[PDB]
Design a binder for this molecule. Structure first.
Ligand SMILES: [Zn+2]
Lengths: 82, 130
């Protein structure tokens, strides 16, 4: 998992879901996942995509994935595997 | 090698807060412990300051007036006693979540578990204070 193109959309959705549900054994683990998420997406909003959605943005796991997918598409970046 | 790890009972009143409670965390001395949380934690014994920290965020999760101002993701965090994530612009590197701060420092005789001596801060504001 070195870049977002290493992830299928479905795999990425699993990562996002884990973060949204705080589905980790420690806070330290969760913070590391959030950091990884920010590194994968390369999105200017960072963890705000997960925790501080812009008004109208869907902050469910699928909503966050779509936002990331659309942003990467619109901004010249490679996408998910497959 | 610490004082924060000695058991103690929580004391203190806290202060009334509103919807901008956590907005206050990135300003000044940070946001107070809500009076509502102080009422729930008063007289409880904690084995370490970290255990106290966990209890604060669990009480936040349980309090509709406080939790209503966290999004679904941050709600999941506080339900586990995790500290909620701050806005990106208040984070500093690997420090991404609200930090509890002692207004009179413990290293200077400040009280560890007196909620009137505790503040909620963002990483950026906490670093600047110290
Ligand atoms: Zn401090």
């Amino acid at each position: 998992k070195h870049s977002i193109s290493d992830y299928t959309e479905a795999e990425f959705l699993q990562l996002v879901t884990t973060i949204c549900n705080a589905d980790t054994s420690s806070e330290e683990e969760l913070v590391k996942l959030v950091t990884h998420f920010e590194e994968m997406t390369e999105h200017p909003s960072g963890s705000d995509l997960i925790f501080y959605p812009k008004e109208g943005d869907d902050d469910s796991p699928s909503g966050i994935v779509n936002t990331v997918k659309q942003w990467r598409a619109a901004n010249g970046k490679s996408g998910f595997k497959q | 090698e610490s004082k924060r790890n000695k058991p103690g009972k929580a004391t203190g009143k806290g202060k009334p807060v509103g919807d901008k409670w956590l907005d206050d965390a990135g300003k000044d001395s940070g946001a107070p412990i809500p009076d509502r949380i102080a009422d729930k934690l008063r007289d409880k014994e904690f084995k370490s300051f970290d255990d106290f920290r966990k209890a604060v965020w669990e009480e936040v999760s349980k309090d509709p007036e406080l939790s209503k101002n966290l999004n679904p993701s941050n709600k999941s965090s506080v339900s586990k006693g995790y500290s909620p994530f701050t806005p990106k612009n208040q984070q500093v590197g690997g420090r991404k979540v609200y930090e509890l701060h002692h207004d009179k420092p413990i290293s200077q005789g400040g009280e560890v578990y007196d909620m009137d001596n505790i503040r909620v801060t963002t990483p950026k504001r906490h670093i600047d204070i110290h």
